[PDB]
Amino acid sequence: GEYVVEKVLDRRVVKGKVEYLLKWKGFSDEDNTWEPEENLDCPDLIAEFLQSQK
Amino acid sequence: KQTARKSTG
């Protein structure tokens, strides 16, 4: 399914591909998942994470 | 809205 994301918590690079750790709206932090970037439709939240990295 | 698809399985 498609769900609303609260925040992008982290990013990792594995096998030449980018994945993000996502906090899902209305779900426990125990339900955070790593998702391939192609799954994401949250550009403003990715922009927030990269700026927090600087 | 900021959404994403959650990988199933």
Which DSSP string corresponds to A25-41?
Answer: TTS-GGG-EEEEGGGEE
CATH number at residue A4: 2.40.50.40
- Interface A-B, measured as beta-carbon pairs within 8 A, has a size of 42
Contact flag A41-B4 (C-beta cutoff 8 Å):
yes
Residue in chain A lying closest to B5 (CA): A2
Residue in chain B lying closest to A47 (CA): B2
As a whole number of angstroms, the distance between CA B5 and CA A11 comes to 16
For this PDB entry, the determination method is: X-ray
Closest to A35 (Cα-Cα) out of A26, A44, A46, A48? A46
Count of domains in chain A?
A: 1
Q: Which of B1, B2, B7 is closest, CB to CB, to A39? A: B7
Give the CA distances from residue A18 to residues A27, A31, A38, A46, in Å, rounded to whole numbers and listed in that order: 23, 20, 9, 12
Domain range for A49 is 1-54
Contact yes or no for B2/A42 (Cβ under 8 A)? yes
Largest CA distance in chain A: 32
